[PDB]
Amino acid sequence: XXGXXSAXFEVXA
């Protein structure tokens, strides 16, 4: 992780 939950910043594959 290390993104801070899903906030639409780096989602895909």
Side-chain angles (χ1 to χ4, degrees), residues 2-13:
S6 85
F9 61 103
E10 201 159 338
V11 295

